[PDB]
Amino acid sequence: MQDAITAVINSADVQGKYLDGAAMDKLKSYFASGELRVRAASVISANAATIVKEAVAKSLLYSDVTRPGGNMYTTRRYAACIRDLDYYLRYATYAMLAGDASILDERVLNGLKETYNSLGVPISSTVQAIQAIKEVTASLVGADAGKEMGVYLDYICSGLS
């Protein structure tokens, strides 16, 4: 993967030149983002299990998904989906801290659609769940940091679907 700083460095290195103001301004922008992103990461790592818990409780919990027949049925499948959401939250925080979504594609969306298709996972149900984590994390962290977390989670959902 690569953070926003590394993206700027790569764009400069492609031309093999030094960083100019057209990259200086974006570096300042990312640095100003900075403490906001790190605080959001801190709070998410704080209540890491909690967002997953309430998101599953609001989207999939007490529904046909967790009922027999639904793919959330059986404790094994339940733990599997919870582990998947732990993946999604950890990688979303990773992308937010880095400032770039490259980690999702290089780590998350790479083959995930096909593997869920092979497993017969409900893509729409997973998308709804991840959206639940998105809004729950937004409410837990605030407006701005919630917005970055939401955009990363929505990129995850778009790639998944």
């Binding site: 818990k53 404790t75 339940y78 733990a79 919870i82």
Partner: protein
């Protein structure tokens, strides 16, 4: 199922089923009438068995029903009723199949993860299954009680 379990063991050893395994399958299929009768009895007394077990659970561990406990409202008590119904159904499935693989595949692997995600006390869940085992033993014959109690004890031990 016992047949599936023996088949899996034979496949792991890369060999045909041994004469002892064939004898076990033959004995199970011959004695299947008793297992079907036990499953019929459990399914019949499903309502009363679960009600008595859940009630005795509630006065045995009132914390779960207490404020702050996991199942405080009538809705959460209903969720416990559904969970205990699930585990009773799984025990009946194990009884008919003659082996614990269906129970383990349905509601034993990752049960700790599920109940940690839900906040549920797995020890109290095991106690609830124990109460269902007690009420079923009361409702069944001694030998039949032992045959079902094998699977109840398996579920309880795995939960604990």
């Amino acid at each position: 199922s016992i047949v599936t379990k023996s088949i899996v063991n034979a496949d792991a050893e890369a060999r045909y089923l041994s004469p002892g395994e064939l004898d076990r399958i033959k004995a199970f299929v011959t004695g299947g009438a008793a297992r079907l009768r036990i499953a019929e009895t459990l399914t019949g007394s499903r309502e009363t068995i679960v009600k008595q077990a859940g009630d005795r659970l509630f006065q045995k561990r009132p914390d779960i029903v207490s404020p702050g406990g996991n199942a405080y409202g009538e809705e959460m008590t209903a969720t416990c009723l559904r969970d205990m119904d699930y585990y009773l159904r799984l025990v009946t499935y194990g009884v008919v199949s003659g082996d614990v693989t269906p129970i383990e595949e349905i509601g034993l692997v990752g049960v700790r993860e599920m109940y940690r995600s839900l906040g549920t006390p797995i020890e109290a869940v095991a106690q609830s299954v124990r109460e269902m085992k007690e009420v079923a033993s009361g409702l069944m014959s001694s030998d039949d009680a032992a045959e079902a109690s094998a699977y109840f004890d398996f579920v309880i031990g795995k939960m604990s």
